[PDB]
UniProtKB/Swiss-Prot annotation, chain A:
Family classification: Belongs to the TRAFAC class translation factor GTPase superfamily. Bms1-like GTPase family. BMS1 subfamily.
Domain of life of the organism encoding this protein: Eukaryota
Subcellular localization: Cytoplasm; Nucleus, Nucleolus
Designated gene of the protein: BMS1
Reported function: GTPase required for synthesis of 40S ribosomal subunits and for processing the 35S pre-rRNA at sites A0, A1, and A2. Controls access of pre-ribosomal RNA intermediates to RCL1 during ribosome biogenesis by binding of RCL1 in a GTP-dependent manner and, via its affinity to U3 snoRNA, delivering it to pre-ribosomes. GTP-binding and/or GTP hydrolysis may induce conformational rearrangements within the BMS1-RCL1 complex allowing the interaction of RCL1 with its RNA substrate. Required for RCL1 import into the nucleus.
The name this protein goes by in its record: Ribosome biogenesis protein BMS1
Species lineage: Eukaryota, Fungi, Dikarya, Ascomycota, Saccharomycotina
Subunit composition and interactions: Interacts directly with RCL1 and the U3 snoRNA to form a stable subcomplex. Component of the 90S small subunit processome also known as 90S pre-ribosome that consists of the 35S pre-rRNA, early-associating ribosomal proteins most of which are part of the small ribosomal subunit, the U3 snoRNA and associated proteins.
UniProtKB/Swiss-Prot annotation, chain B:
Source species of the chain: Saccharomyces cerevisiae (strain ATCC 204508 / S288c) (Baker's yeast)
Protein name, entry field: rRNA processing protein RCL1
GO biological process, one term: regulation of rRNA processing
Segments passing through the bilayer: none
Gene3D superfamilies in the cross-refs: RNA 3'-terminal phosphate cyclase domain, RNA 3'-terminal phosphate cyclase, insert domain
Primary localization class, coarse: nucleus
Length: 54, 355
């Protein structure tokens, strides 16, 4: 269950590495985001990131 | 011809890594089962762009476009114009040039023509405020993307000038083991062929989500009209969390479609920026592949980069597997000594002169 090792084990798929560790193309520059609905609800409060600010 | 890859996945990265390493590669089974097999017009256009900036490369594409053999030439650069097909905006073509330009014999001075924005690719602001500050941290002192004309989809008519005056031996060795503190939020809300009210409405939406934060929020209103605004109505917004101390940045971007609400776009991108910050450490997910490659190609020394657990996704995994196939370099990950977060340190021995 060591992520650094799991990454370099070609017999295991990338999605399986993440599952074993805890719990898909660079041709698309923009990273994945959850739906606006889910994000708007989660981000009504900015407390979870207050430490990242001065 | 012998280091072999499968599918269209990471096409630009694989060609970029082959170019930087000087190692020949083969990309096979590109969209093999599809009705329309092989390379898309934008991938062929990207290969023509690679040929224009290098000298002595051999590019062989199979009849149906399902196989590409790439024997890289030396990075030469120079002044050229690249016509981007409608299928991809200018950013799709500018982005891989960022990985090559500082390592060229001559300066890259490339005029890119076509659509300037999409929902999936790096926009003008993403390059200028997201990627370029990362390359500056790596020693690319002078890099610029000049916006001559904007070109919203579907008709485009945009024009950007990429100029990388800084030619360096290799990126400097990366040492960022802290979580940079965000000092302010900036951004650019732009529009083409429309009333100035649309930009003001996006800024209203973004401000509604960001007003709860303890920092300054200053979003630039960038209204484009007339000839230099391109051929189609359009609008978009890029929001950038700035860290003044060292010059790090976090960003989110998107464009609006016809009939969409500008306030909603502003809100969404602001929500996406906060989400990107929550998932970040030294850099955001959209700057991480560039930062990773720049450390792989540094001098023979250990570079350190703080990464968030949320950044170790399937995209990060495939990136690392592609790097190892080309350079044989492994990224080592060690947890931080802190209990406040679950971040880790990515340690990378730069390639230097190693073969």
């Amino acid at each position: 269950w060591n992520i650094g090792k799991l990454i370099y084990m070609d017999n295991i798929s990338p999605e399986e590495c993440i599952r074993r560790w805890r719990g898909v193309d660079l041709e698309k520059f923009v990273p994945y985001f959850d739906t606006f609905e889910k994000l708007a609800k989660k981000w009504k409060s900015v407390d979870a990131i207050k430490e990242r600010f001065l | 011809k012998y280091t072999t890859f499968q599918g269209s996945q990471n096409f630009r990265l694989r060609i970029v890594l082959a170019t930087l390493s000087g190692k020949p590669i083969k990309i096979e089974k590109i969209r093999s089962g599809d009705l329309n097999p092989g390379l898309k017009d934008y991938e062929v256009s990207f290969l023509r762009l690679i040929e224009s900036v290098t000298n002595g490369s051999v590019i062989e594409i199979s009849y149906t476009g399902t196989t590409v053999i790439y024997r890289p030439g030396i990075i030469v650069g120079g002044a050229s114009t690249h016509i981007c097909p409608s299928s991809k905006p200018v950013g799709y073509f500018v982005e891989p040039m960022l990985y090559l330009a500082p390592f060229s014999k001559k300066k890259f001075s490339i005029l890119f023509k076509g659509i300037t924005a999409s929902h999936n690719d790096a926009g003008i602001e993403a390059i200028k405020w997201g990627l370029m500050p990362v390359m500056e941290k790596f020693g690319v002192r002078e890099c610029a993307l000049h916006t001559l004309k904007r070109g919203s989809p579907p008709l485009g008519g945009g024009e950007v000038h990429l100029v990388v005056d800084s030619l360096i031996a290799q990126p400097i060795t990366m040492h960022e083991i802290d979580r940079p503190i965000i000092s302010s939020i900036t951004g650019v809300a732009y529009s083409t062929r429309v009333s100035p009210s649309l930009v003001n409405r996006m800024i209203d939406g973004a401000k509604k989500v960001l007003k709860n934060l303890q920092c300054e929020v200053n979003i630039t209103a960038d209204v484009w009209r007339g000839e230099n605004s391109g051929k189609s109505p359009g609008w978009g917004i890029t929001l950038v969390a700035q860290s003044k101390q060292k010059g790090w940045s976090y960003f989110a971007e998107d464009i609006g479609d016809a009939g969409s609400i500008p306030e909603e776009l502003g809100e969404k991108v602001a929500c996406q920026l906060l989400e990107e910050i929550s998932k970040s450490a030294a850099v955001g997910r959209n700057q991480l592949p560039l930062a990773i490659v720049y450390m792989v190609i540094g001098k023979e020394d250990i570079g350190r980069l703080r990464i968030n657990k949320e950044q170790i996704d399937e995209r990060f995994i495939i990136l690392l597997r592609d790097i190892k196939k080309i350079f044989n370099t492994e990224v080592f990950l060690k947890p931080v000594d802190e209990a406040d977060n679950e971040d880790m340190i990515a340690t990378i021995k730069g390639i230097g002169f190693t073969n």
